[PDB]
C-alpha cells in the first residue's frame, strides 16, 4: 500500500505530450564541456587580436530548481519518477502546486540526463525562453495543465 | 635491556650524536640589524635591555638609543591592464566627462558599473595618459 | 540570544507544507479523533504520557487544534 504523496508519481505524462515536451526541451541544451571549451579558445584567438546577449538553456540542479520554484522563475518543471531516495523529490510536486508553477512528472531519469549533458538529472526546468518558442512553451503549459493536472486532481487522494 | 645489549655488542656501531652545545648557544636568524647587535655572552632579557626593545609586555613574575635609531632608518624608506586602458579610451573619446550618459550607455559600458567606478578608473587613466 | 530565532517566512512555509504532505503519525491520528470525541482535556492527558513533559503536550494539542480548524472550514 502506497501513501498518496508516493504514487503521485507513476501517474506520469503520456506518450504524445512527453514527445512534444522534448521537442521543446532538446532545443534548449546546455553547451557541453567540449563545445564550451572550443568557444572560449575562439574567444581567446579573437579578443586577444581584434556584445553577446544572455543565452537560454535548461536549468538542472535540484538545489537550483528548488530555488527557481518559489523565486518564482521556473515556468515548466520536469520531474523524474525513478529516484534512488524517493524522499529527495516527494515534496517537489506539492511545492509547484503551492507556488502555482506548472510542473510535469516525466518518465525516466536518464531520459532527463540526455537533454542535459549528464547521466541522470531527477529534475529539469526551463526558466526563460527565446521569443519564437514563447507561444509554443505557453501552449505546452496549457497542454500539461489539461492532461496532467486536471485529469489527476484526485492524485492527492487514493492509496 | 635486551635491545641495547646487542647494540653495544655489535660491530655496526652507534649513531653517535653530539648536540648539547647547540641547545644553549642559539644564533639569531630573523633580523640583520639584531644579528650584528646581539651579545651571545649575555642572555635573552639582558640583550633586549642592551638594545632598548621590550622583551616582555606583561609585569614579569620574580625580580630583576644606538640600535633602535637604525630601525627607524629602515622605516623612512599598481597600473591598469591593456584591455582596461583601451576600453577607457573608447569611453572618453565617445562621451568626454558625462558619467551619467557613460553608465546608461550599453555598447561600450557592458558591465553595468556605477558612476563612481568609471570615474575613478578614468582618473587613473588621466594620470598615465592625457 | 540577540539572534534568538525570528519567524522566517520560508521556514514557516516549509514546516506547514511538510506537516500536511507527511500526513499524521499513529498517536496523532488517535489524538485528533480523541479531541473531537473525548474533548481537549483527555487529549492533553494522552499526549503528556506519549511525549516527555506537559509543556510539549500543550503546544502539540494547540497545533492539532490549528490543523483541524483550518482543514474543515478553509
Amino acid at each position: 500500500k502506497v501513501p498518496p504523496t508516493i504514487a503521485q508519481f507513476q501517474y506520469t505524462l503520456d506518450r504524445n505530450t512527453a514527445a512534444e515536451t522534448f521537442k521543446l526541451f532538446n532545443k534548449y541544451r546546455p553547451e557541453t564541456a567540449a563545445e564550451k571549451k572550443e568557444r572560449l579558445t575562439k574567444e581567446a584567438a579573437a579578443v586577444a587580436e581584434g556584445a553577446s546577449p544572455k543565452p537560454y538553456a535548461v536549468k538542472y540542479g535540484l538545489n537550483h530548481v528548488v530555488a527557481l520554484i518559489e523565486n518564482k522563475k521556473a515556468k515548466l518543471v520536469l520531474i523524474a519518477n525513478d529516484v534512488d531516495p524517493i524522499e529527495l523529490v516527494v515534496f517537489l510536486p506539492a511545492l509547484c502546486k503551492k507556488m502555482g508553477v506548472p510542473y510535469a512528472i516525466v518518465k525516466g531519469k536518464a531520459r532527463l540526463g540526455t537533454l542535459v549533458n549528464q547521466k541522470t538529472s531527477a529534475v529539469a526546468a526551463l526558466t526563460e525562453v527565446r521569443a519564437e518558442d514563447e507561444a509554443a512553451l505557453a501552449k505546452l503549459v496549457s497542454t500539461i495543465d489539461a492532461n496532467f493536472a486536471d485529469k489527476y486532481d484526485e492524485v492527492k487522494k487514493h492509496w | 635491556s635486551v635491545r641495547k645489549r646487542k647494540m653495544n655488542r655489535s660491530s655496526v656501531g652507534k649513531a653517535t650524536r653530539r648536540n648539547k652545545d647547540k641547545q644553549r648557544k642559539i644564533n639569531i636568524q630573523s633580523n640583520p640589524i639584531i644579528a650584528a647587535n646581539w651579545d651571545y655572552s649575555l642572555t635573552m632579557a639582558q640583550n633586549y635591555k642592551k638594545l632598548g626593545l621590550r622583551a616582555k609586555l606583561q609585569t614579569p613574575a620574580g625580580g630583576k638609543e644606538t640600535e633602535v635609531v637604525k630601525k627607524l632608518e629602515e622605516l623612512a624608506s599598481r597600473s591598469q591592464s591593456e584591455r582596461e586602458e583601451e576600453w577607457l579610451e573608447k569611453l572618453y573619446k565617445k562621451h568626454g566627462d558625462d558619467y551619467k550618459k557613460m553608465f546608461f550607455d550599453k555598447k561600450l559600458n557592458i558591465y553595468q558599473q556605477s558612476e563612481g567606478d568609471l570615474k575613478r578608473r578614468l582618473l587613473r587613466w588621466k594620470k598615465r595618459n592625457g | 540570544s540577540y539572534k534568538k530565532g525570528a519567524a522566517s517566512n520560508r521556514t514557516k512555509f516549509v514546516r506547514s507544507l511538510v506537516r500536511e504532505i507527511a500526513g499524521l503519525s499513529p498517536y496523532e491520528r488517535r489524538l485528533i479523533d480523541l479531541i473531537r470525541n473525548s474533548g481537549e482535556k483527555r487529549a492533553r492527558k494522552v499526549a503528556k504520557k506519549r511525549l516527555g513533559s506537559f509543556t510539549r503536550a500543550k503546544a502539540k494539542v494547540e497545533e492539532m487544534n490549528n490543523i483541524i480548524a483550518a482543514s474543515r472550514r478553509h
Binding site: 553577446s52 544572455k54 518559489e70 523565486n71 518564482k72 506539492a94 502546486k97 503551492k98 507556488m99 502555482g100 492527492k156 487522494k157 | 557592458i110 558591465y111 553595468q112 558599473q113 | 517566512n9 520560508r10 512555509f13 506547514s16 507544507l17 506537516r19 500536511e20 483550518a70 482543514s71 478553509h74
Partner: peptide, 26 residues
C-alpha cells in the same frame, strides 16, 4: 487532502536582492 497548497502562493519565499552578476556578461 491537498490542504495548504490549494491556497496558491504570491510573493516568492525570500526577499534577497539579485546581484549585478546576473546582468552584465559573466
Amino acid at each position: 487532502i491537498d490542504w495548504f497548497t490549494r491556497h496558491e502562493e504570491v510573493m516568492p519565499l525570500t526577499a534577497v536582492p539579485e546581484p549585478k552578476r546576473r546582468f552584465v556578461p559573466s
